[PDB]
Ligand binder design. Structure first.
Ligand SMILES: *[C@@H]1O[C@H](CO)[C@@H](O[C@@H]2O[C@H](CO)[C@@H](O)[C@H](O)[C@H]2NC(C)=O)[C@H](O)[C@H]1NC(C)=O
Ligand SMILES: *[C@@H]1O[C@H](CO)[C@@H](O[C@@H]2O[C@H](CO)[C@@H](O)[C@H](O)[C@H]2NC(C)=O)[C@H](O)[C@H]1NC(C)=O
Ligand SMILES: *[C@@H]1O[C@H](CO)[C@@H](O[C@@H]2O[C@H](CO)[C@@H](O)[C@H](O)[C@H]2NC(C)=O)[C@H](O)[C@H]1NC(C)=O
Ligand SMILES: *[C@@H]1O[C@H](CO)[C@@H](O[C@@H]2O[C@H](CO)[C@@H](O)[C@H](O)[C@H]2NC(C)=O)[C@H](O)[C@H]1NC(C)=O
Ligand SMILES: *[C@@H]1O[C@H](CO)[C@@H](O[C@@H]2O[C@H](CO)[C@@H](O)[C@H](O)[C@H]2NC(C)=O)[C@H](O)[C@H]1NC(C)=O
Ligand SMILES: *[C@@H]1O[C@H](CO)[C@@H](O[C@@H]2O[C@H](CO)[C@@H](O)[C@H](O)[C@H]2NC(C)=O)[C@H](O)[C@H]1NC(C)=O
Ligand SMILES: *[C@@H]1O[C@H](CO)[C@@H](O[C@@H]2O[C@H](CO)[C@@H](O)[C@H](O)[C@H]2NC(C)=O)[C@H](O)[C@H]1NC(C)=O
Ligand code: NAG
Ligand code: NAG
Ligand code: NAG
Ligand code: NAG
Ligand code: NAG
Ligand code: NAG
Ligand code: NAG
Ligand code: NAG
Lengths: 204, 167, 418, 50
């Protein structure tokens, strides 16, 4: 799981190991050690070999630094992402999909890890699904009724309005639903009673 | 040079001796004695990758000669990635284990051996769509997943002078 | 002197609002590069192709070749990871039902075509038709184009038959008209706007998709993003190949000619110039490929985010999923890239009205619960903010707070008691 | 070379003269006069910041 951080550590270590091992390369010079060349050859002869070693080692150092710049750009991208996830997942609740884990994000918790961060993404995943018959609207006295916040479902014979993400059916009354139209335009409208809370109250 | 000399139908003019390719390589040559045109093709070369199941699991090894027709190189498979030698081709599709390429992956499975198959992108699931049917969840799950993000690397400073010209 | 578009003085006044009485459904296309070609340059064979003397001279440079090969292999594995992150976002492989009762919306041009040997749709086919040996190998991608099309087809089928529910958990079916009513709520337009205008909305969607097809068939500059990636990888490779025909100061650019002409003590001197130049050329290539692959990885991260938020959900982020209010998006594979058909709601046919922040009645101030007070000159209605649907102002429409001696611009009217 | 020589607990084998690190940098030596093993550490260096 911690592969993402261990890989970064390993990459940096490999870059340093390559850089150090580059010190044992002749690069076309007589020897890979400056001390041996200095002790054996006089300066007029040794300067060419030292120039070869200098060019090779400077190119090695430049390659190391340039790949470090590319790798640090990658780490800055990841750190910008982690800062965004700290701001949105930890300091808020994110409506972005899959930004704070699969599911509907509830919260997140940061945990420091060596050279990184670990987000414990708490998410709500709907579990046990039931089939129902659904209708876009409901005809009652000619009017078309649509759920204020919910969906019309039928357990086979009866019609309820439930919230969309969790089956909690409720009797369809005028507080659950709002009216728009005359039941001629909706494609899939169904006939059913819409209760009126005020009617029994006025009756009694 | 070094290569395979195949008699070719290049339309060499009488005053032309060799035909450099776009890459300015002598693709074809006129034979000095018999005035005939011979295309030159480099001798077969490619990468050699080794599909291993893990030394702890097994020491069996399948070898991918990348991008060479098997006829130009016991079980032999001609994948679009190259010639796979030592992996038994299987019609069943499982998840990708060792990605070989071109939709083909290898895995160590049952007497056990390395098998090369076309990877399966998960289980097919036709949704029970209907114009008046809805699925509504009656319960839930509180899942705590984990996300791991690198934040910083090791701060290294290299003395250019001491590295290049140590003392 | 270039023009920065057209001048427009918005008719602002402290008591006037413009409310759209109609709308358009616009499908725009967003092309994002996802991966690049997985080349791999054999450092030894490029520098010293079939030359033992040159290879031994190259061994004196240490691990330059090994680290260049490691860099290019990392780039190749990264390209495969980019493709996986964009497309393998669907756990299962969903299929559209045999009966396409999608409320009049017609996806036949984006749903896969059985007649084609590939699981490839009409528009994916158009996009694919549009976008077009010296140690230099090209590894095939792990996922074939047929597998990429299977992935985008599963994404499409899950989207159409389940909404955003498949992004969160198990795909829960919902009729496409009902899903569209949900996605209308997502942008602040009531459900009845979809239900009462369903045929018009479906026709606008179908016509928008048809215009997408026609634009793709006629003009090829849309896929310029992915093509530019192709033309940059190819150009880099061609420069790398053409750098083999440089002396770099040597007597010749041909190792075989150098070797056949010079005894080894004299030859090495020129072979070293060839090695230095060619190794520098390889380093330049690999560095720019690392930079270019970082750019492609940023692009593929964006494409994965747009798949998650535009396709697996509905985005409240502005202009993230097309200009307008995002309703839904559809992924289409493309060569080394993805194409999103961002379906958006664009309000239309705006009209002027007189707007009041609150309405005084019986001394108390009323504000609309959801909506805005407008007046067509004499009568005051409370309407949705993104679609003109006036309603009589009652106490269900409005909520009271305080008296009328505080609010600036409050008008006088009647909130009918139901 | 240049460095600081300290007594070492490394168990050299009799035929071995000196010991190298992972990156093939001389890490220990054996004194030819007295058959004893000395660890060689680089003389301390570091950036001077102000
Ligand atoms: C659909 O739901 C309705 C109401 O929830 C069910 O009607 C009730 O059923 C219970 C037994 O399950 C009875 O005790 C009640 O008296 C019923 N009330 C009414 C008003 O009918 C109905 O049985 C359910 N139908 C199905 C097929 O599940
Ligand atoms: C819902 O109920 C209404 C009336 O309660 C039905 O309208 C009737 O439709 C039939 C056939 O179309 C006509 O013969 C009647 O005259 C209509 N009645 C009225 C009062 O207009 C409507 O058909 C029902 N819907 C469904 C799907 O059954
Ligand atoms: C919703 O799911 C939870 C489990 O995720 C159910 O809780 C389990 O209930 C069974 C039987 O009552 C017990 O044996 C388990 O120990 C419970 N698990 C946990 C974690 O509490 C719960 O009953 C489900 N509710 C519905 C309405 O289906
Ligand atoms: C809303 O705009 C649509 C067009 O975007 C109008 O539909 C057009 O109506 C005209 C005249 O009725 C027809 O000729 C066109 O064929 C229709 N186009 C489509 C795509 O159906 C619609 O009438 C407008 N509605 C309002 C209330 O202004
Ligand atoms: C969805 O759109 C396609 C093309 O826009 C329709 O296919 C056309 O169908 C008509 C007959 O209705 C044929 O004459 C055309 O040749 C077809 N064109 C193509 C490209 O297939 C398709 O019918 C539409 N879907 C529905 C359900 O009508
Ligand atoms: C503003 O809108 C109101 C509400 O529709 C208009 O009042 C109605 O106007 C129609 C004719 O357009 C009459 O048939 C109704 O009797 C009117 N109703 C009432 C309650 O007066 C009103 O005319 C519109 N005013 C302007 C200036 O457009
Ligand atoms: C809205 O109506 C209220 C009362 O119905 C108006 O308040 C009157 O304001 C005038 C002038 O300031 C006073 O002379 C009256 O005594 C006020 N009436 C009451 C009952 O206090 C108010 O002016 C109206 N607002 C507008 C914009 O016309
Ligand atoms: C809904 O009905 C279809 C019809 O066959 C069935 O395949 C599916 O499993 C049902 N869904 C549930 C949750 O039972
Ligand atoms: C659903 O589609 C079927 C045909 O597939 C049709 O007969 C039926 O009337 C439709 N029902 C609704 C509610 O749209
Ligand atoms: C000698 O070379 C000439 C010119 O290439 C050719 O025409 C002729 O056949 C050759 N004869 C022999 C003896 O090879
Ligand atoms: C390999 O060569 C044979 C002989 O021509 C040919 O039939 C076959 O198609 C080749 N395979 C590939 C993958 O090129
Ligand atoms: C796989 O199936 C094809 C046809 O479905 C058949 O020709 C081939 O022999 C099978 N391969 C194996 C290893 O069984
Ligand atoms: C609203 O009124 C102003 C008054 O100048 C006019 O310029 C503007 O076009 C009007 N808006 C519409 C939609 O007609
Ligand atoms: C709008 O401003 C004008 C003058 O610019 C002023 O007469 C009027 O009272 C203001 N209306 C509101 C509602 O503030
Ligand atoms: C060299 O002589 C010294 C005595 O001064 C002795 O301690 C040491 O072991 C000798 N080293 C040999 C014989 O290698």
């Amino acid at each position: 799981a911690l592969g993402k951080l261990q890989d970064v550590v390993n990459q940096n270590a490999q870059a340093l190991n390559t850089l150090v091992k580059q010190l044992s390369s002749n690069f076309g010079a007589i020897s890979s050690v400056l001390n041996d060349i200095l002790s054996r050859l006089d300066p007029p002869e040794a300067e060419v070999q030292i120039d070869r070693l200098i060019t090779g080692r400077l190119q090695s150092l430049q390659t190391y630094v340039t790949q470090q710049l590319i790798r640090a750009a990658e780490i800055r991208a990841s750190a910008n992402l982690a800062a965004t996830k700290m701001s949105e997942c930890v300091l808020g609740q994110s409506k972005r999909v899959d930004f704070c884990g699969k599911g509907y994000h509830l919260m997140s918790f940061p945990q420091s890890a060596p050279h990184g961060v670990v987000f414990l993404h708490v998410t709500y995943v709907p579990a046990q699904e039931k089939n129902f018959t659904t209708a876009p609207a409901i005809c009652h006295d000619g009017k078309a009724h649509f759920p204020r916040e919910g969906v019309f479902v039928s357990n086979g014979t009866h019609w309820f309005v439930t919230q969309r993400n969790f089956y909690e059916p409720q009797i369809i009354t005028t507080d659950n639903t709002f009216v728009s139209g005359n039941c001629d335009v909706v494609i899939g409208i169904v006939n059913n009673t819409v209760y009126d809370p005020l009617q029994p109250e006025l009756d009694s | 040079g070094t290569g395979v000399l195949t008699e070719s139908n290049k339309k060499f003019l009488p005053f032309q001796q060799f035909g450099r390719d776009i890459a300015d390589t002598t693709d074809a040559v006129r034979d000095p004695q018999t005035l005939e045109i011979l295309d030159i093709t480099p001798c077969s070369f490619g990468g050699v990758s080794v599909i291993t199941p893990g030394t702890n699991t097994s020491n069996q090894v399948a070898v991918l000669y990348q991008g060479v027709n098997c006829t130009e190189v016991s079980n032999v498979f001609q994948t679009r990635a190259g010639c796979l030698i030592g992996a038994e081709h299987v019609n069943n599709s499982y998840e990708c284990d060792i990605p070989i390429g071109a939709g083909i992956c290898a895995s160590y499975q049952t007497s056990q051996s390395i098998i090369a198959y076309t990877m399966s992108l998960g289980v097919e699931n036709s949704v029970a769509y209907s114009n008046n049917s809805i699925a509504i969840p009656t319960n839930f799950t509180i899942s705590v997943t984990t996300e791991i993000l690198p934040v910083s690397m090791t701060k290294t400073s290299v003395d250019c002078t001491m590295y290049i010209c140590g003392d | 002197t270039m023009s920065l578009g057209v001048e427009n003085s918005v008719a602002y006044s402290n008591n006037s609002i413009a409310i759209p009485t109609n709308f358009t459904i616009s499908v725009t296309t967003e092309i994002l590069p996802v991966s690049m070609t997985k080349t791999s340059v054999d450092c030894t064979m490029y520098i010293c192709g079939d030359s033992t003397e040159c290879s031994n001279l190259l061994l004196q440079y240490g691990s330059f070749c090994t680290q260049l090969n490691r860099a290019l292999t990392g780039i190749a594995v990264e390209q495969d990871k980019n493709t996986q992150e964009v497309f393998a976002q669907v756990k299962q492989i969903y299929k559209t039902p045999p009966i396409k009762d999608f409320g009049g919306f017609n996806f036949s041009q984006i749903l896969p075509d059985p007649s084609k040997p590939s699981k490839r749709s009409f528009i994916e086919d158009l996009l694919f038709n549009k976008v077009t040996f010296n140690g230099l190998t090209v590894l095939p991608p792990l996922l074939t184009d047929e597998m990429i099309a299977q992935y985008t087809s599963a994404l499409l089928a899950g989207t159409i038959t389940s909404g955003w529910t498949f992004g969160a958990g198990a795909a829960l079916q919902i009729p496409f008209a009902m899903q569209m009513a949900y996605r209308f709520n997502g942008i602040g337009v009531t459900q009845n706007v979809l239900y009462e205008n369903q045929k018009l909305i479906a026709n606008q969607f179908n016509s928008a998709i048809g215009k997408i097809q026609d634009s793709l068939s006629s003009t090829a500059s849309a896929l310029g993003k992915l093509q530019d990636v192709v033309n940059q990888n190819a150009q880099a490779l061609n420069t790398l190949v053409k750098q083999l025909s440089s002396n770099f100061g040597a007597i010749s650019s041909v190792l075989n000619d150098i070797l056949s002409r010079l005894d080894p003590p004299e030859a090495e001197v020129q072979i070293d110039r060839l090695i230095t130049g060619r190794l520098q050329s390889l380093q330049t290539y690999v560095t720019q490929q690392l930079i270019r692959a970082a750019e492609i990885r940023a692009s593929a991260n964006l494409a994965a985010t747009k798949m998650s938020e535009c396709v697996l959900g509905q985005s409240k982020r502005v202009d993230f999923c097309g200009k307008g209010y995002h309703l839904m998006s559809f992924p289409q594979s493309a060569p080394h890239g993805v194409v999103f058909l961002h379906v958006t709601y664009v309000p239309a046919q705006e009209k002027n009205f007189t707007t009041a922040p609150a309405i005084c009645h019986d001394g108390k101030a009323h504000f609309p619960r959801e909506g805005v007070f407008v007046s067509n000159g004499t009568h005051w209605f409370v309407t949705q903010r993104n679609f003109y649907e006036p309603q009589i102002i009652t106490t269900d429409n409005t909520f009271v707070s305080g008296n009328c001696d505080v609010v600036i611009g409050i008008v006088n009217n009647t909130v009918y008691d139901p």
